Amino acid sequence: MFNNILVVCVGNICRSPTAERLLQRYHPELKVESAGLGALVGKGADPTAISVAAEHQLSLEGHCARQISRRLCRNYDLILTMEKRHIERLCEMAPEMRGKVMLFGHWDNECEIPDPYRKSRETFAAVYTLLERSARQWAQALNAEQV
């Protein structure tokens, strides 16, 4: 059971906390946390990410952005992201975790997901919908594959 996960995106404030909370919604006992490759360390969750989460009654409350570092990569047992470009950076940062970085859309023909950054709420909702199905597939795998 890879109970300890760190989700990662570029600016941190959006996809990482959305994924964190979606994973917690489907597995309350999961230790899941959120960071970024070029994080806005100290900022809260993005107002637009909060808005689309609240439109599905999920609460990105109390998120704090965190620059991922080699120490953070060692701290968890599965590193999770949304794009294969980010897998490449994370493998370069922590070769010791290269076999343990994967993406949300892995279970969907390894499809990668846009980053909503500052685009309209429709973009935030489109990535939220992608993240929601991906989080269900990750939760299904987490629930299964017991040993």
UniProtKB/Swiss-Prot annotation:
Which Pfam families does the record match to this protein?
LMWPc (PF01451)
* The protein's enzyme class: hydrolase
Keyword annotations: Exopolysaccharide synthesis, Hydrolase, Protein phosphatase
Q: Which family does it belong to?
A: Belongs to the low molecular weight phosphotyrosine protein phosphatase family.
The protein's Enzyme Commission number: 3.1.3.48
> Which protein, by its recorded name, is this?
Low molecular weight protein-tyrosine-phosphatase Wzb
**What SMART domains does this protein's entry cite?**
LMWPc (SM00226)
| Pathway of action | Glycan metabolism; exopolysaccharide biosynthesis
Known CDD domains for this protein?
LMWPTP
Report the protein's function: Dephosphorylates Wzc. Required for the extracellular polysaccharide colanic acid synthesis, probably involved in the export of colanic acid from the cell to medium. Involved in protection of cells against contact-dependent growth inhibition (CDI), probably due to the loss of a physical impediment to cell-cell contact.
Database matches in InterPro entries:
LMW_PTPase, Ptyr_pPase, Ptyr_pPase_sf, Tyr_phospatase_low_mol_wt
Loss of function: phenotype: No phosphorylation of Wzc. Loss of mucoid colony phenotype, greatly increased susceptibility to contact-dependent growth inhibition (CDI).
Coiled-coil parts of chain: none
Q: Where is the active site?
A: 9, 15, 115
Any single GO molecular-function term of the entry would be: protein tyrosine phosphatase activity
- State the reactions this protein catalyses: O-phospho-L-tyrosyl-[protein] + H2O = L-tyrosyl-[protein] + phosphate
Q: Name one GO biological process term.
A: colanic acid biosynthetic process
